[PDB]
Design a protein around this ligand. Structure first.
Ligand SMILES: *[C@@H]1O[C@H](CO)[C@@H](O[C@@H]2O[C@H](CO)[C@@H](O[C@@H]3O[C@H](CO[C@H]4O[C@H](CO)[C@@H](O)[C@H](O[C@@H]5O[C@H](CO)[C@@H](O[C@@H]6O[C@H](CO)[C@H](O[C@@H]7O[C@H](CO)[C@@H](O[C@@H]8O[C@H](CO)[C@H](O)[C@H](O)[C@H]8O)[C@H](O)[C@H]7NC(C)=O)[C@H](O)[C@H]6O)[C@H](O)[C@H]5NC(C)=O)[C@@H]4O)[C@@H](O)[C@H](O[C@H]4O[C@H](CO)[C@@H](O)[C@H](O[C@@H]5O[C@H](CO)[C@@H](O[C@@H]6O[C@H](CO[C@@H]7O[C@@H](C)[C@@H](O)[C@@H](O)[C@@H]7O)[C@H](O)[C@H](O)[C@H]6O)[C@H](O)[C@H]5NC(C)=O)[C@@H]4O)[C@@H]3O)[C@H](O)[C@H]2NC(C)=O)[C@H](O)[C@H]1NC(C)=O
Ligand SMILES: *[C@@H]1O[C@H](CO)[C@@H](O[C@@H]2O[C@H](CO)[C@@H](O[C@@H]3O[C@H](CO[C@H]4O[C@H](CO)[C@@H](O)[C@H](O[C@@H]5O[C@H](CO)[C@@H](O[C@@H]6O[C@H](CO)[C@H](O[C@@H]7O[C@H](CO)[C@@H](O[C@@H]8O[C@H](CO)[C@H](O)[C@H](O)[C@H]8O)[C@H](O)[C@H]7NC(C)=O)[C@H](O)[C@H]6O)[C@H](O)[C@H]5NC(C)=O)[C@@H]4O)[C@@H](O)[C@H](O[C@H]4O[C@H](CO)[C@@H](O)[C@H](O[C@@H]5O[C@H](CO)[C@@H](O[C@@H]6O[C@H](CO[C@@H]7O[C@@H](C)[C@@H](O)[C@@H](O)[C@@H]7O)[C@H](O)[C@H](O)[C@H]6O)[C@H](O)[C@H]5NC(C)=O)[C@@H]4O)[C@@H]3O)[C@H](O)[C@H]2NC(C)=O)[C@H](O)[C@H]1NC(C)=O
Ligand SMILES: *[C@@H]1O[C@H](CO)[C@@H](O[C@@H]2O[C@H](CO)[C@@H](O[C@@H]3O[C@H](CO[C@H]4O[C@H](CO[C@H]5O[C@H](CO)[C@@H](O)[C@H](O)[C@@H]5O)[C@@H](O)[C@H](O[C@H]5O[C@H](CO)[C@@H](O)[C@H](O)[C@@H]5O)[C@@H]4O)[C@@H](O)[C@H](O[C@H]4O[C@H](CO)[C@@H](O)[C@H](O)[C@@H]4O)[C@@H]3O)[C@H](O)[C@H]2NC(C)=O)[C@H](O)[C@H]1NC(C)=O
Ligand SMILES: *[C@@H]1O[C@H](CO)[C@@H](O[C@@H]2O[C@H](CO)[C@@H](O[C@@H]3O[C@H](CO[C@H]4O[C@H](CO[C@H]5O[C@H](CO)[C@@H](O)[C@H](O)[C@@H]5O)[C@@H](O)[C@H](O[C@H]5O[C@H](CO)[C@@H](O)[C@H](O)[C@@H]5O)[C@@H]4O)[C@@H](O)[C@H](O[C@H]4O[C@H](CO)[C@@H](O)[C@H](O)[C@@H]4O)[C@@H]3O)[C@H](O)[C@H]2NC(C)=O)[C@H](O)[C@H]1NC(C)=O
Ligand SMILES: *[C@@H]1O[C@H](CO)[C@@H](O[C@@H]2O[C@H](CO)[C@@H](O[C@@H]3O[C@H](CO[C@H]4O[C@H](CO[C@H]5O[C@H](CO)[C@@H](O)[C@H](O)[C@@H]5O)[C@@H](O[C@H]5O[C@H](CO)[C@@H](O)[C@H](O)[C@@H]5O)[C@H](O)[C@@H]4O)[C@@H](O[C@H]4O[C@H](CO)[C@@H](O)[C@H](O)[C@@H]4O)[C@H](O)[C@@H]3O)[C@H](O)[C@H]2NC(C)=O)[C@H](O)[C@H]1NC(C)=O
Ligand SMILES: *[C@@H]1O[C@H](CO)[C@@H](O[C@@H]2O[C@H](CO)[C@@H](O[C@@H]3O[C@H](CO[C@H]4O[C@H](CO[C@H]5O[C@H](CO)[C@@H](O)[C@H](O)[C@@H]5O)[C@@H](O[C@H]5O[C@H](CO)[C@@H](O)[C@H](O)[C@@H]5O)[C@H](O)[C@@H]4O)[C@@H](O[C@H]4O[C@H](CO)[C@@H](O)[C@H](O)[C@@H]4O)[C@H](O)[C@@H]3O)[C@H](O)[C@H]2NC(C)=O)[C@H](O)[C@H]1NC(C)=O
Lengths: 291, 97
């Protein structure tokens, strides 16, 4: 039954995102908080392009600044002065421009270093959320992960996580174990199960979802000495909380004199009856023969 | 699974929390590597409590068609079958005479 609602709630979520990418922003800001992530995702992509543009726009703009020379165009320097005097002017521009190139190279090399550190996270997420369904909290999606979808973007990747969110809750009357005869006690082995009882029937479910079923003997260990806040129940009525459990040796004592109850043997049939009556039969035969 | 001075118990490998073993913790690993514990099936309950052979017990003392109702082990109200046929032979001799 879950898959009937999940498809309906997922198809609308896809449409909302594809509409939000369509630049229609303020009309759907009232809908939900899905805008809170798409706005940051768009701002990051805008910034990664603006920063790339500005670096070259700054480099190409330092040719205008003439250094302590006549002008910033060399053809003008060689047009006014002779050959022996222009060499003391050209080098003043040459030294400035070489130092300008060096600072740009030293920045590009630093820029490349961050990208390799960012690629490790991209590979790790591909390895852990796309192929394995990782279970670490606070990792892909803030809830319970199901799957993920990848798509490309300007020199980057764009993920699409898919999580679950609870809507309704249920109230459950929990317990902590079963103590039989005050000394022997049973508790659940796995620490992710809750033993509970509503209006006279006991069931076992999980702690994350609500999937009730019937308890079985294969889920209890022996926890002797019976903490006080347990369930008081005698061993003769243990089958009312744990089905598929019957005492093997006590029934031997009971079912022994009690077979005639369930089910009653046939009367006058060998070898249930007609013993000790054959001495009487012999006596009657002798009496009849004598008579 | 460990045993001190004749009693077997099961604990964890990180902390020391002893308790009693139960049948719900064992699988069947047939062909018995040599460095195991040698024990016969008639005495398996001394290492695993809450375990009994279901069919061997009925093979031992569940013998008659019902267990009883029928003259069974040392039943006092009942009497002896197959203890009148010798007298039947004697009385047959008397009848022939
Ligand atoms: C399931 O199910 C099943 C079925 O059911 C099961 O199976 C089974 O079951 C059953 C049931 O039925 C069970 O049974 C049970 O049981 C329980 C428990 O038990 C306990 O107890 C017992 C007894 O008590 C015991 O046995 C056990 O164990 C043991 O222990 C012990 C201790 O105690 C040990 O040791 C031992 O000891 C002894 C004594 O002591 C001995 O030793 C010794 O020692 C000493 C020192 O110490 C030494 O020195 C000496 O000393 C002196 C003084 O003391 C002098 O000085 C001298 O000089 C010197 O020398 C010496 O030497 C020594 N000896 C020698 C010989 O050496 C011995 O030996 C030892 O051994 C042991 O080891 C142990 N064992 C083991 C194995 O381990 C326990 O503990 C019970 O409880 C029960 O019962 C109850 O209940 C019932 C009901 O239910 C009731 O009824 C009862 O009551 C009864 O009543 C009756 C009436 O009716 C009566 O009867 C009467 O009797 C009388 C008689 O008296 C007396 O005796 C005789 C013998 C003689 O003597 C005479 O003379 C006198 O008098 C008359 O006859 C009248 O007539 C009548 O009536 C009775 O009695 C009563 N009882 C009583 C007891 O009392 C009760 O209450 C039941 O029985 C079974 O078990 C089972 N099985 C098994 C296997 O287990 C199953 O199990 C089930 N399962 C589940 C899981 O559940
Ligand atoms: C729990 O518990 C419970 C209760 O307990 C249970 O239940 C039950 O139990 C019981 C117990 O008791 C059990 O029982 C047991 O068992 C065991 C096992 O078994 C095994 O073995 C058997 C037999 O051997 C079998 O049956 C089985 O199975 C089977 O197998 C088979 C194979 O082998 C198969 O097949 C088959 O085969 C057959 C044969 O072969 C047939 O076939 C055929 O084939 C052929 C070819 O091959 C063909 O061809 C032909 O060939 C020829 C040649 O060979 C010619 O040539 C011609 O011509 C041609 O044709 C043919 O055809 C064919 N046939 C036809 C008909 O077709 C058949 O058929 C087939 O079928 C099968 O299939 C199978 N089955 C199935 C079902 O699957 C197995 O393997 C056992 O072991 C046991 O026993 C043992 O032990 C005891 C003690 O305990 C002992 O005692 C015994 O010994 C004995 O002794 C006695 C004395 O006392 C004796 O008696 C005697 O007898 C004699 C007789 O002889 C003969 O026979 C007759 C019949 C006739 O013939 C005559 O003549 C002759 O001589 C006299 O009578 C004297 O007087 C007396 O005394 C006996 O015998 C002995 N035995 C023997 C064997 O030997 C032993 O040791 C037991 O029994 C049951 O089982 C159960 N149930 C069930 C269900 O199971 C339960 O189980 C439990 N549970 C748990 C979980 O544990
Ligand atoms: C499974 O069953 C087992 C066994 O049946 C059970 O184990 C014991 O359960 C009891 C109760 O849950 C545990 O606590 C005991 O309580 C005793 C108190 O009962 C007397 O006192 C009542 C009033 O006392 C209260 O109010 C006063 C103020 O007025 C306050 O100071 C007290 O602290 C307390 O809060 C009184 O009403 C009661 O009377 C009953 O009976 C009359 C009929 O006679 C009826 O009309 C009443 O309505 C009422 O039902 C009674 O007089 C207490 O005495 C006892 O103390 C014992 O132990 C201490 C040591 O701890 C000793 O020093 C002391 O001398 C006593 O021996 C105890 O505190 C008890 O701890 C459990 N365990 C044991 C071993 O006894 C489980 O709880 C059950 N499990 C379940 C139900 O899940
Ligand atoms: C549960 O029980 C089962 C069955 O009972 C058991 O299974 C077998 O257990 C045995 C022993 O643990 C395993 O090993 C066998 O050992 C045999 C050796 O016994 C003879 O040799 C003794 C001296 O030999 C030693 O010293 C010499 C140097 O002197 C050295 O070269 C040898 O290698 C060895 O180290 C000797 O003392 C002994 O005599 C006994 O009996 C006398 C009374 O007669 C007594 O006075 C002594 O004190 C002593 O108790 C005996 O003569 C060995 O022969 C045997 O070899 C067989 O298998 C090989 C193939 O592997 C064949 O080639 C060979 O011909 C034999 O058939 C074997 O090595 C054995 O492996 C187990 N399994 C089987 C299938 O037999 C389990 O171990 C038990 N589990 C437990 C206890 O946890
Ligand atoms: C083949 O084997 C069978 C065994 O599988 C066997 O069945 C049983 O045999 C036992 C002994 O052989 C019988 O025990 C006897 O019980 C006498 C007491 O009987 C009184 O109650 C009778 C009614 O019984 C019904 O009610 C009781 C509960 O009260 C219940 O337990 C029974 O199962 C019955 O449902 C009375 O019978 C009257 O009523 C019936 C109708 O129900 C009529 O048909 C009768 O004719 C009669 O009117 C009876 O009168 C008694 O009141 C024991 O007698 C003791 O007690 C009395 C006082 O009541 C004393 O006066 C005696 O001196 C004595 O102390 C008697 O000793 C013995 O223990 C058992 O009842 C049989 N069960 C059944 C279901 O029949 C077969 O008998 C056997 N057959 C053969 C041919 O061998
Ligand atoms: C209902 O079924 C019953 C069984 O299913 C059946 O009981 C049997 O009846 C038979 C007769 O029909 C009995 O056989 C007789 O046995 C006499 C022997 O008696 C001597 O021993 C008695 C003690 O017996 C105990 O010890 C022997 C071992 O020695 C053991 O085998 C027994 O099982 C007993 O445990 C003496 O009784 C005295 O002691 C008891 C206590 O033990 C007291 O309660 C008594 O009151 C008494 O004080 C007895 O005194 C004898 O010493 C045979 O008699 C021999 O001895 C006399 C001399 O006294 C000779 O003159 C004889 O010639 C003969 O040699 C007798 O001939 C016969 O064989 C059988 O023992 C009974 N079994 C049981 C278990 O009781 C019922 O008959 C039946 N009901 C119906 C109506 O049929």
């Amino acid at each position: 039954e879950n898959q009937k609602i999940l498809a309906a709630s997922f198809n609308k979520a896809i449409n909302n995102i594809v509409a939000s990418f369509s630049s229609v922003n303020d009309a759907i800001t009232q809908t939900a908080e899905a805008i809170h992530t798409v706005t940051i995702a768009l701002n990051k992509i805008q910034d990664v392009v603006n920063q790339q543009g500005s670096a070259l726009n700054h480099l190409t703009s330092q040719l205008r600044h003439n250094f302590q020379a006549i002008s910033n165009s060399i053809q003008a320097i060689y047009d006014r002065l002779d050959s022996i005097q222009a060499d003391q002017q050209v080098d003043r521009l040459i030294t400035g421009r070489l130092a300008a190139l060096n600072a740009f190279v030293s920045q590009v090399l630093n820029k490349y270093t961050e990208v390799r550190g960012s690629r490790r996270l991209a590979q790790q997420k591909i390895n852990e959320c796309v192929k394995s369904q990782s279970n670490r909290y606070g990792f892909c999606g803030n809830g319970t992960h199901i799957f993920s979808i990848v798509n490309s973007a300007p020199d980057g990747l764009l993920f699409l996580h898919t999580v679950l969110l609870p809507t309704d809750y249920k109230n459950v009357k929990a317990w902590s174990g079963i103590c039989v005869d005050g000394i022997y006690g049973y508790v659940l082995r796995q620490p992710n199960l809750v033993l509970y009882s509503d209006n006279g029937v006991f069931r076992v479910t999980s702690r994350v979802m609500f999937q009730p079923r019937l308890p079985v003997l294969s889920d209890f260990v022996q926890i002797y000495n019976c903490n006080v806040t347990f369930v008081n129940i005698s061993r003769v009525e243990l089958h009312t909380v744990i089905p598929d459990y019957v005492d093997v040796n006590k029934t031997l004592q009971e079912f022994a004199q009690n077979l005639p109850k369930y089910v009653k043997p046939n009367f006058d049939l060998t070898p249930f009856n007609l013993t000790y009556l054959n001495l009487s039969s012999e006596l009657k035969q002798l009496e009849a023969k004598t008579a």
